[model samples]
Target chain A: TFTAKTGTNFGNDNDAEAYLQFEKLIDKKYLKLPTRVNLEILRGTKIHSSFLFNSYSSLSPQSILNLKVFSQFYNWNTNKGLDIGQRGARLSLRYESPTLFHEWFLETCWRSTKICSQGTSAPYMYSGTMLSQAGDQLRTILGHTFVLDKRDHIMCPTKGSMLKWSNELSPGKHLKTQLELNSVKSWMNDDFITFSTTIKTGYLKNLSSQQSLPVHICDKFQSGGPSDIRGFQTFGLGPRDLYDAVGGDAFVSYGLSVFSRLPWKKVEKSNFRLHWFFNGGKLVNHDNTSLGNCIGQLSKEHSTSTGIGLVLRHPMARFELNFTLPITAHENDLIRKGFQFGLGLAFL
Target chain B: DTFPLQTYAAQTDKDEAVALEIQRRSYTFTELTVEGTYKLGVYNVFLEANTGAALATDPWCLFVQLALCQKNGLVLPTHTCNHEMLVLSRLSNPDEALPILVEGYKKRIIRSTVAISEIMRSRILDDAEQLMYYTLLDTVLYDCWITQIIFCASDAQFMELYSCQKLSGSIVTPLDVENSLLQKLSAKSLKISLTKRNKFQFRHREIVKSMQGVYHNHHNSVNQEQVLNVLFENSKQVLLGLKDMLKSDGQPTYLHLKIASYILCITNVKEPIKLKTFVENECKELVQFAQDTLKNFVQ
Candidate 1:
């Protein structure tokens, strides 16, 4: 009778939805052929009105000191209530070639999303009927990758002399293309960011919702590998709001590197690489940010870097541990050079 | 000042020969490139682009850094421009009249004696140090000490130290500079007291005066609801505590007068007694200071 009861209601004790996920690989690392895929789903929630919930609000000066004041996006007041969640998973198929400079990677994933009240509380409070509903909302990402080695295996004993390419498409809203001229005999590194309609903001009183859709597609060129730029390892540092932040402008970049492979010389005779790279790039805003509204008029209209990097590989994979310093700040104020150190595959 | 700026100027091979001629003489310039195209102007010739397409990408003329800085009352040092001949080589056109500004920079190079790099570096580091000390250490530490003195000492003393004219500068002990600092540390670090400066008056000092609740701790106004009651019934306990502490043949330890100040800080009334907003707003820090000072008091 209780199960079939009509309009039975139970109040939530407190608020916010909490969930967990777990994962493990089935013998990954060696030419991941029969890769694996795992999925999870759970639901347990409380009523929204019982308590208040916020990610990062800057109402208090103390809060300003806490969250990124000018970085990540903030939550706006949109009275949509209700919370819904479904399932998410991981899928991958990778095959490592015995010969250096050869490999492939492919993956796809999905998840559920819902709408919660803004700082204004429950979504029901909104007068607009169009904004009240919450849905599973589907989100997906598909990608592929390729790597190449340079020394021809005769003079080097590392992960492979390298060059690589990867493309990620989120169908409805985001697209990203990456090309890394990997030179690991020296050091390892990767420069990347996504171009999407979603915002990469911490606080904005003038924007629409805190998070928006991709207003345009993206074309990116980031230097990858230890020999590329010495100071940074793979995906080292920068604003990672990356899943988005690329909408208004056309995203572009350039990089040059010259790194030390002395660490690699111990295992094999061939080592060390000298490179002068130039990275040129740009990001066009979708809101049609004409000549007047762009942030930082002249200098900021572009993001360029010419990095001279020197890497020291540990006679191991094209793994690099070195340092890099850019030639100029002609375009971005986002990254810098210092020391480069880490474990992983790197190439020039 | 360690600006990694790259420049490009497009000039004829003849001008390039002159540039090389200058470079040949030997100077600090380790590397230089004379590649961007040059165009004749009313005043002098100028550069249009650099090898890096730096000038080509001049969708917007001139450096924006200077424009934004000038709006804020800042001026870039004159050294930014070389001689008239070389200066025009860098600018796009003959419009030397267009105000060149300094953007969000925090520096202004003076005469030759004041190097931009030296002053900017020193200023930045000095500011960083002061910010670390004032914001992280002093605001909290100094506030704690000042709040204690305000809680125990009378308003007269509070007003004295708070007023710039009447007092001791940077002293805290027995609620004054000496007592607070000495009791908190080994008398050594507290060596430099208000007395160190020839002037020892309370008003001359930079103390946390009677603030009307600006910072979380600064407060002066009494609660509206607590006034009448304290004057009637609620005043007894506080007055009694003060009397008992003062009556002791020895000096009075704040153990009792504190009860009075606490009451003074609380609500405006007494009977049917309601807790004052002061205690709610301030009682935590004040009370904690009370318990702490009381720990040393046996009676």
Candidate 2:
């Protein structure tokens, strides 16, 4: 129907006009009822891609099975000649019966690139061309999450605790493990002041390198960005591959954040919250992460950071601006000199 | 015409000692009973109750009142320690009433402060009378705002407040099998059972525990996923009970519960479009409701 309608476009129905009309129609339909499809098309200077999908029931209570598929193209460094396609189909199952179980995520992806046609010496480092640079892979991951949230308010809890742990596996390749704990306590009048803390630890381990896995198998944990260490660069720290820009295998990080209510009483249209945090992480190469040396030098290689953040909460997410400073770092470590903006989402 | 002081002098040994120490400090406190006509429903009702205005305006009261003024949001203030100590010193028995009330009040202040959002803070600052009532009024108001005619039962005093339209009448109902504040208030006379009193105190303690969770879950990130996964189902239900109460009742006796509902509703919610607007709308309503609850008494 879409293709047939496009062919009958009038003379004035140019590309922009057609696109605007299409959007208007879609917006109207979505307003009346729950739209089955969630389509997002993003265009930017360096990247352009569209993500679309629909979710439905699995019959049983608290169980949902999602069928999702998307196509993406990445121009490494925005270099047209060095373009790559990362298209894939993903299937996920979520069973939310208290002490939730989220399992059976199947991802089948293809890695297509034209860089092979270039004579040699491809300048990009993250996907260093020293070794085989392109391949397709099938991955599956499963997880079980147990959480008991006692906080009176989930947004900015002043009392209660949250404890959780999960494991991710790329069968026959790598297994990742993680654990996190958070506690909030209030001490002052009206319970306005809060002392909050979060503790998290995670590590990735290789399963079998002797099998000579696909190029994607070498993907290492990237730290230092807002998602990892706030004061550091996004995916900036950790060991490097032969390209020197690629992340290395294995990593560990910890974060502690304190939040407080702002002091401005009058003329304050919206209340404000102040956040202070200290975080540190260590990323070591596969060979150097010795179990023997781990205990003694864990803190030595740790890259530490301290910073402050502000948050304006919205239901779907929190908009935050963090002014970060790296306290400990190597000469080559990437650091976010000052403020880094972030969106905190409950959904991954 | 001026009436007698209506003051209850120190008769017990500890009370006498407290009176003597306070006289050295020359701090005299009086409880006032004022007779006034209140408009209730179709008719004008005559009411006589101890205003407790003098008691609340005492210097120590100011310290606690200001302590409750947390910038815009309440935090256990720097002066909280002294505030508790001051209140405790005025009581006859530090071991009995002082410890429970003082400890419970601090906990209430801390928990209630946690529930206060920026908007609620602004609303609180805007209404001085309600703020004063919340800052000083407590279950203690049972004695602080009762008339000589309503002296037969503790339940009658609360009932009288309902009669005067100071309290929302929807709370107390026909007797229930479960031991609850409403059931306790239903009693015909003042028979202070320890269990019944403890039940009332439990509300503050329960509120304290709930706020503790919010403080820890700041940003709604911690155990954000856990409640979705239910290993602690028993405790989860218990905690959910508080939020549920806030939902069913538009008028909650505890300000903390009201704020907690709004906080939980807006955190990690799926609808992001109207999050701010929704939060603001609900906060205003909650604040207005709370203000309405206390406005009549303060007036």
Candidate 3:
């Protein structure tokens, strides 16, 4: 595998509040208002030698001859754990001074992030085999901020080149509380590289979503993975790769959630809400240990796709989903996406 | 290891199979069988699922012995068991009991490991601890009768037994109650191996070695002493006693017998040579012991 990535950004806060939106938690004046900070950092490392064991047995005749095998098991299908890394950074900032509607406002922002996967010494060794196993380690912060009212309406929305960024982040009104739905889809580019697209949307009920934020919903419902999308788990359509991820090829989604307190003394101090969501992501192989290592044997028997789930929340990202049914690419029970039963924090 | 194993890809069929197996393998009289998993690694080496054995009689005995120790007001650290990772559970708050079981391995004792296929060093170590090792065995056996230890290793696992310097002295459960628990509940094959790892590649290296060694030593002038040594070195006096099968075809040849008797002979192997032999055997036992660890780590 071969991987290499490089990039940069210039013009500090001059274009920060002037171009993007970067007011999240870290506010100036409020926490040193109108702060200008430009920084860069680099990181590189390779996680190697994780072993995956073969079939379960006791007799001993069945065995593989690998020392590292005893310590770790590879999730064969998803090349998730393939050895890889990358480096990048953003030099940006926000310009904010309390507006009439809210005390702290996100005047501007910008950042970039890139990731490179596996690396190799050879350049022309079976292009597929030499799969750079790498991608841009994102390092960017480019997006505009809009000050809004207590209402779920947008105060100042920006579009076009102003929305330049490696990733997507959408913020909503000064809601008292909210329920959010997040999903990403990245296609397998090379043996160790992948290009992903993520879309995250949220519905806020209360102002700033602070006090009324639903925290933990009843965990009684047995919701796990694809069965119920609300719980916090990995992808629903595919198995995790060495990176321990679904290694998504692509995806689509729809969601609905209400952030409200459950008044159960017939409706008193109960903290809870209702949620509904749906998702669709492309999965070439349900189980891909390496993000790009699609087993040649991915027979038609293997399905690649997923979407299904509804959630109720306490608003603080903790909730349970009664049904997060999955739809497989194929309609065969043997190759169908099965339901999961358990608990988790969705989109955390 | 994922947080919750129960809901991960749970199938009615698998659940039914587990339930049926659990029902079939349990409680007719003395004890109930919970779960069992066996992994064959490289070199004829195999790993057992320690769940079933965890809830077995042996762990139960440890729990009982600890109770006895505590009841007698013993100040033993209980970490001396050398199993359960020696992780003593400290009272997060000062309000906690004194001499409580260690958290992780410290807090509780292995009740039984019969059903589990993995090697249980905690149980094995406890057995060695309990075996009092001949005269050593006599001494620990006598110590088991003490009340402080009983209170510490036992009551500490349950309700508060020690706090400050005094025994909160609350016996959350009596001996009879503990006995009933041992009789009533049992562990299951909840987690086959750590993270329910892919079964195929497991132990292939170890399996290959065991196969090689078993083939090499199966018949060639091996002695009973060697066989004993193999058993002690590999399986030992622990739970399943299956280390005896590490040889070719698993049937002891003369060499096998030699291996078996070798354990007893170690008493006179020029002490250093005996220790050397033990170290070689530990190569196998250590691997076996490591296999079943971390099963319930996520839970």
Candidate 4:
């Protein structure tokens, strides 16, 4: 066992967020490979194997195999990556399961990457500005997730509900699909004033056309930054080609937020709330559309934003500070009105 | 059916050649037929002035010096002790309710675990005092006070044993009853195994690894026909049910002679001075009537 890691980061946003990464590692584990002469009902399940090298990331070099089952809490993994003009393999499966209104998960994935869309191969990878010949890709996904977390606080929440949908279980090629709905409710929730609101919506699809095959450079549906539109920047909008780097293929978005409590009692038991938010969305470009006309290119031309924030609700981290403004736009967008900041362990 | 008789360190030696000198008089017996041990006021305890090497070589140290002299007067206010008589009629003076009885005795020692066979099937002792309180609940466990505070303690002797708050008060004990009594005298001889009636098993990991190489002195570190091939591969059926309860005399067979003297002192099969000279050479007058009833009740 040997591992070395070095990292550097800078704030006040973008210079690619001031970057640096260093890595060296070696790992070995072959736990419970079963059959040590029938060890009492095959000792649960386990296997972990690793070998990795990176000097800047995007998995410059890799090899990983993970399998877990502890009497069905399920997990399965495979990641070949293996750099230099890159290679393939990325298979995953996760299951959560627990009912009566909360906890749910089922995931299935397959990722195959064949690189050299531009080439400058091996110098410990990820050297900027390259998606040259549009990169190689083959994706498969199947997902079903339901959370119903009844959130009280993971960051400015007073109540909750979360929903998600995922499609495209690998039939042909170049496909991606998604759907999400988030809802949060709060009102004088045990006094000190908490009137919360958050309505979220998301959508994205590609369905294949292969305009010289390049769109898999992160299967489209771009939305601003710090987790989808909070003053913009990071991928800041959608649908682009000829080097905009922003992407999309029939996408949709929506957000609504509000939070209170500033009665001033030295942060009323971990407060930081004082917010107001409203966000809207839109994006479309289903090159070779299918799924029956992909539904009237998605509604009222979307794209709007408005905000004022300061949320800090700790307990497994969450921090935010916004002052946004991007009333409307759909022409090479990249907004970032006033101040923006966000940190997460979740709830962003 | 009556006990407390008292009188045997060699039948009160009136000299006449040591009362007609009888067959190697159990090497002058020694003592430990139960009676001496009960002080209670300020948690008193006693019983080791060598009872034939603490009872035929460590009878669970005379069963935890007689269960910490009965769990140290089961922590005062007896009135027929059972949970310290409801922790003294409900904290009537636990010295002015000691900071809420030490936070309610640390929430009953972190949600209880003192069941020593439900406190020796409680009734506060009966039938040879619940057979020496289940033979001193096999002399201390809980991994022998977590291996004596992870090997020989100190941290102000473990906070003066948590300020002797009677093992966090609610009366549940097992050496290290909140540490002290030097974790039941350093968990006297470790690894005690048993199965019994699941068709008999019993083990003391080769007599606590040869009594931790001569009694755990900062832990010491092995033989013998290997001690007559471990006494003919560990005597089963408790050596013919202890020679059919010694042909009679230990009448009504006090649970077949205290379970063949706890499977011959935890299955040693000879060696501990050849099983204490083969049990004082085959019960030399029942060890001179229990060392003359513990020498008239320990002086």
Candidate 5:
């Protein structure tokens, strides 16, 4: 079978993309091996095109082994006369766990890039001084991820817990890790009302010999926005350069929420609930500071907001309309007070 | 290779142009007194060690000073002239920031540079060419200066210009602020490449399209040499255009003042002298004319 699709998005930036894919199943009865191929092109500020080929073979009734190959090309030029071009390829093998929630992968990748500045218009100093080591490099990465879910319902959980942990290492470059946990406990008191509290804190560190490896901006941890922290602008709770938000190395966020049915029985039976929530978080960058000092700084100051809203749990996605009030914020943070609306599958 | 020259001529009567020129030149430094009291609010100003007078370090504030000087012979408020102006630290409203022009009696407040220019009647010739050149200055030239000063300048120079206890409202050192700004600028440059959307994307696109063949040649081969050639040729074209405009009237317009302000700001910048060298060498006549015309106000 084959599939083709095209999509476009409009927001801070605009982008259009199209993709074509082919899939087939062979030897289904004896030793099932599923194969797939994909080709895609994306156009925006930059141009990106890629090709992927993958196959999965069953090792046992509950486990599988997967192999994949990927290649991509990228090109972009800024208005200030900076030009950049890159090409790369990757090969990986993954072994799935006997259970549904654990996996491990090993990958090797090689990429080459050419960056140059024109005249005095582009940032010649930055390109020549700061990014001197960002030419051609190769990386071999090994990664593992684990997840645990014991929820009663996927859309609106009554009583359950979820945990996720991921770790990766690039031998000469850096080591990275992330962890998150969510718990929901509900009880009824005459009328149907439930309360849930979630505490989330994630830290990303580029542990190198002596800042030998360069960390790309895209690899940093970004926080805030409606889905993550309701009262702040998207990625607005971090260090800034004029108007741009440079994401941080570590973040800690938490939420306390109460969900209840409407007063009318007819409305209560519908898929809508009234919500009251409070969220607080802090994001910090550790460029020249130690982990202990950065964490100490993060613990001292934080931004907090409280709001009341309406939520609708649909089969496809959840929706919300809220009135938020920010209690405290940093000097540089962009806060969104009054009314905020969101539609997504994930919430904190 | 040879680059073609693009020139734009003003369509107006010679007699009327002469009359307007005379009117602009008629104002002398002796007429330093004005009718009413006016106050200007800026980000910050420090006393020049040698001159012992308050000089604005911020570009917009310096622009405002030049504009006010040209329009009304108004002197910037210094330690001795504190009655007419104040710093942003003393303002009541936290939302109202720098480069504010205040009319004391009427109690009027103007916030933005464009609005202040309009109120002061500083701009001349509201034509397509004027607007195009303004956009070029505001977008391309402005970004170039910011990248140079913030990302490229040495630590001592950067601190000398930006580190202020009044502006920051805290006790943070200049190094702390400099590191944060460096992180932000590096990330912003990365995002600009990936998204192809700099802060002034639309305006920059319009100006580039207006440049015709000069900017279009880089589309085929975007190497450093070709890109530099394209930009240098275009810069020459713009400076030539401005020079031609000045030739007709012999009066420094708002665009001229803006360019002069940038040149003055970077006079002390030591490292990465590419922009400074280009302006001083290629646009020698224009730079000299700007300095000669604006010397009285700058001192």
Candidate 6:
């Protein structure tokens, strides 16, 4: 079988991407083995191309094993004044529970880059730091992810509870973890109204004693956006320098939303609903400060917003058109007022 | 016949009398009193922090502080001193823009130094003069200062002086702060070099371009000296213009204070000894005046 897909995202860093996949299924003596190949290209300020090969087979009636080989090349002109190019590859194996849905994976990754070219107008401050990280690196990461879903429907859940947790440890570098919980409760009367709540939090820390292997920006957690928290710019909630949102070491965000069918009688069966939501979160990074002090600060202040909008649960993606109002925000946070539009498969 | 004639005359006389009365009442006048109250009120001025004991190093923040001190008879305090009228770093502010003034009672925030000056009655330039000098200051001098601070200064100097430790506190290391500063300053320099066209644009570009040479040589003394020469020359021309304006005005005004503040801030910078020497030689009188004014208005 073969499949092709193309899409574009229009926000913060706008980009378009295309993907091609080829898959084959073969019957083994006891189980069927599926092998797949994927090719992808992404174009934007940062250009990326990748290739992946994967094979999976049933180990037992309820167990499966998978292997993946992936490689990619990326060129980025970061918001900072450096232009960088990198090529990297990863090899991984995964074990999964097909029914209860749990997965564990171990991956070893190698990345190589030459010297980065500074922009003609680059600032003095960034040259030293960016130069230090512009070289070759290798890391082996072990990871596990688990999910539980009890929703009546996935596209537009009227009632259900979902939980997801993921953890990754790159020995000698850092440990990263994330947890998310969502619940929906509905009351059916003359009008069907549903209340949903979501909570998400993450933490990343450097395990290496030497400062040589500091946590990379890519591995840090970033929060705020139309999908993560409405009324804030994409990845806008965090400690920031003058130009870029250097993501945080730890973050917590929560959302409360109420949804109901539109008042118009004729559109009751359609996927359109009225939504009112409130979202709040905090993102903090650990520098020389102790983690206890950092987490303590996170619990003190939160950037928050509230809004109402129309939600459409399409077959492929969910669409939201919201009129947002930010109630409280950090001084540096980028805030969006009035109308904000979003499209994605997951929303908080 | 005489009785009928008398009746007609009487009716006509009554009608004329009524019309005359209406015309007399057509025009009327009344007086009204409009009353209101305004107070300068207590305020907090937010500024960018400096490495030294001074509350702020930004020229604009210093300008505002000087204006407020002269106008309201308030004293400028160091960062360590606490006062009802607080001077704070931009990091403490939710709206991070510097030289912001917040009214205590009404909790009203004023974002522009120009607006603050107006409210404080610190403006001395008339409408036309204000427009011209403001344009000169913002266009020519502002870019020069940014270039000097970002490109001319060493990384250690920039970090020690400009980085907002409060904002980066426990969140990002000094390296991150430096990186952010570089990106912002470079982008700003690029914007000015491209968009602005003026007599000063040439010198501004020269300074910027010379910094590139400095970068190439990795702080080669020859390249550094060249950059300093261009920068000092630009500063000399701007300071000369300001000196001419001051001499003509005779009396210190808001514009003079602004100029004085800029001079004081730049003079306080220890690097690039040539800049200090140029100011001292070319604008010696202006420097003295700046010192006197700062002493009088700032504690």
Summarize candidate 6's per-residue lDDT along A201-253 as a digit string, tens digits.
Answer: 88877676544345655566777777789988776777654334556778899
Give DockQ for candidates 1 onward, in order: 0.02, 0.00, 0.01, 0.00, 0.02, 0.01
* lDDT for each residue of candidate 1 in A102-193, tens digit (9 for 90 to 100): 22223221111222333122212121111111111223456555555454342233333445566665554355555544332322431111
Best by TM-score: 6
The TM-score that candidate 6 achieves is 0.49
Local accuracy of candidate 5 as per-residue lDDT tens digits, A1-348 = 455665432222111234455556554564445444444444312344565556666665545566666655433222212222233334434434112357777776544343332222222212211122223334567877787767666668777887778777765555667777777777786436778777777666655555534454444566677777787777667655323344566778888888887768778777788999998887766543467776775686677788999998775567788888777676556677788887766777
lDDT of 5 by residue, B190-245 (tens): 22321122243353443333232234455433443344445545655665666654
lDDT of 3 by residue, B208-274 (tens): 2332233346343244234334533333233124244333553222222222222322221222433
- Lowest summed lDDT across 10 adjacent residues in model 2 chain B is found at B37-46
Candidate 1 structure quality by residue, lDDT tens digits, B221-264 = 33311322333233233333323233334432222223322332
Stretches of candidate 3 above 4 Å error? A1-236, A240-276, A284-348, B1-39, B42-274, B277-299
Give a tens-digit lDDT track for model 2, residues B27-146.
122111111111001000111122222112121122223223222122221210122112221111111111111112111111111122233445556667545543432322212112
Q: By how many angstroms RMSD does model 2 differ from the true structure? A: 32.8
Tens digit per residue, CA lDDT, model 4, A1-348:
122233322222221121222222322243322211100111111221222222111111222222211111111111111111121223323332211121122222222222212111221111111112112122334433444444554445565665555554333333455666566665675544454434444344433333322344345565666556666675656544322433555666777767776667787666577767877666555434464554455564455677788877666455678887777656555666778887654332
Off by over 4 Å in 6: A2-16, A27-48, A73-99, A111-136, A189-191, A210-212, A287-291, B1-299
Candidate 5 chain B — worst ten consecutive residues by lDDT sum?
B1-10
Candidate lDDT (C-alpha), each = 0.27, 0.39, 0.23, 0.35, 0.53, 0.56
The DockQ of predicted model 5 stands at 0.02
Candidate 2, A27-54: lDDT as tens digits: 4344442223333343311344534344
DockQ head-to-head 4 vs 5, winner: 5
The 10-residue segment with the lowest total lDDT in model 6 chain B: B4-13
Residue B246 lDDT, candidate 4, scale 0-100: 39
Please provide, for model 3 over A164-258, each residue's C-alpha lDDT reduced to its tens digit, 9 standing for 90 to 100: 11222223212211122322222232111111122322221212132221110010011124322322233323333211232222222333322
Those runs of model 5 whose alpha carbons end farther than 4 Å from true positions after fitting are A1-22, A26-32, A36-57, A66-100, A107-140, A189-191, A287-291, B1-299
User: In model 1, where do residues sit more than 4 Å from their true spots?
Assistant: A1-87, A91-137, A146-163, A181-212, A215-252, A259-310, A315-324, A330-332, A335-348, B6-299
